[PDB]
Amino acid sequence: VYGRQAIEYVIKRMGSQMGVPYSWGGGSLDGPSKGVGDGANITGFDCSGLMRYGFAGVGVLIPRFSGDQYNAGRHIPQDQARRGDLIFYGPGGSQHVTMYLGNGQMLEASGSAGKVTVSPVRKPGMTPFLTRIIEY
């Protein structure tokens, strides 16, 4: 499917920003941008910002805020979690959002060393549902 290929593309595109620093409020549709607050001096990505930039690469525009990204596709139960599914943290996903790589790995903007990186999926705070944007 084209859906499966779009997701690989999205993931790969996000992956191309590996190491780009974390920046609160940072991110555009075309790449890292200066954030705001303490992000004012860093040209990078916050969590939701990376996600957005990734999906922009296949032409899908998702909201700026992880809480609204949470409601931007279909809610998936943890046990149906799929590579390409968005992972949320905090009530209604208001705190963090990351990309599920499959295999208990995720891609996220704020990893130790405040950079885009690959981490094991974490349990504390995780919202009940993932969100599928692309229905491959």
TrEMBL record:
One of the entry's Gene Ontology molecular-function terms is: cysteine-type peptidase activity
Q: Where is the NlpC/P60 domain?
A: 4-136
Coiled-coil region: none
Q: Which UniProt keywords apply?
A: Hydrolase, Protease, Signal, Thiol protease
Top-level taxon of origin: Bacteria
**GO biological process terms, semicolon-separated:** proteolysis
Keyword Phosphoprotein assigned to the entry: answer is no
* Similarity section: Belongs to the peptidase C40 family.
- This chain belongs to the protein called NlpC/P60 domain-containing protein
Q: Which organism is it from?
A: Mycolicibacterium paratuberculosis (strain ATCC BAA-968 / K-10)
| Top-level taxonomy | Bacteria, Bacillati, Actinomycetota, Actinomycetes, Mycobacteriales
Q: Which residues of the full protein are shown?
A: 109 to 244 of 244
